[PDB]
Amino acid sequence: NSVSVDLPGSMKVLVSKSSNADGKYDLIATVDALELSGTSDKNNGSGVLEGVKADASKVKLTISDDLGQTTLEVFKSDGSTLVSKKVTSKDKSSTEEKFNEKGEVSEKIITRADGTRLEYTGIKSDGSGKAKEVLKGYVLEGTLTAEKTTLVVKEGTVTLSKNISKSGAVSVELNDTDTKKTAAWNSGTSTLTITVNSKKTKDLVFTSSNTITVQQYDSNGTSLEGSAVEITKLDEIKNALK
C-alpha cells in the first residue's frame, strides 16, 4: 500500500510502501483536484509526478531528493513551453512565475517566509518591470531593472528610495530638492540616518524582519532618545520624511 508524505507548498504525496521489480516506487498526489502520478527510484516521496489540467495543459510536480523543495509547473498542452512555475524552497518561501508564449518570465511573485512579498509585474525581455513590496500594514511601489528594484516614497521635496540589488542587498537613499534633509546609509546596521542643519534627526532601520523602525535623536543631534518605533502604515514613513 502507500504512506502519506508532507511536502513544502501545502501539498502531500502518497508513496508506495514497497518498490516494484525495477526498484521503483509509485507516487500519487492530488493538487487542487488534479490527480498527478509518477514513478521514482527513491522511497521517501521525492521524484516527479505528472497530470493535466481540465483544459489539457500539462502539469508536473517535482519534489527534491531530500523533500526540501517542490516545484509545481504548468505547460502548454504539448508540454513544450512553460505557462507557470511555483517553487517552494526549504525555508518555505516561494516564487510564483508566469511566462509568455516564448517562455519568458512576465510576472514573478516572491513570498518570503514571513509572508511579505515582492511583486514583479509586466516584466519585459530585459528583465525590467513594475515592482511592489508588500509589507505588514503597507506597500512600497516602484520599478524593476536587471540591476535593482527601486521603491520610492515621496513627501514634500523629499524622495526616499529603497533599492534592492539584483543580489538582494538593500541600500536606502534620501534626496531633497530643497537640500534641507540629507541622509547617510550604514550597510552594516541597515540604518539610514537623516540630518538637518548638521544635526542628526532620526534613524530609519530597515530590519532583517522586513520592517522599518524610526527613532529620533535628542535636540543635541548626537544621542538617540527614547526607543525605536515600528512603522505600521505608509503615512508613518511619510511622517518620518517631514
UniProtKB/Swiss-Prot annotation:
It comes from Borreliella burgdorferi (strain ATCC 35210 / DSM 4680 / CIP 102532 / B31). Belongs to the OspA lipoprotein family. It is a lipid-anchor. Changing R117K: In strain: 21343WI. Keywords: Cell outer membrane, Lipoprotein, Membrane, Palmitate, Plasmid, Signal. InterPro entries: OM_lipoprot_Borrelia, OM_lipoprot_dom_sf. Changing K12N: In strain: PBre and 21343WI. This is Outer surface protein A. One of its GO terms (cellular component) is cell outer membrane. Pfam families: Lipoprotein_1. It is found in: Cell outer membrane; Cell surface. Induces host (human and mouse) cytokine release by monocyte cell lines via TLR2 and CD14; nonlipidated protein does not stimulate host cells. The keyword Ribosomal protein does not apply. The gene is ospA.
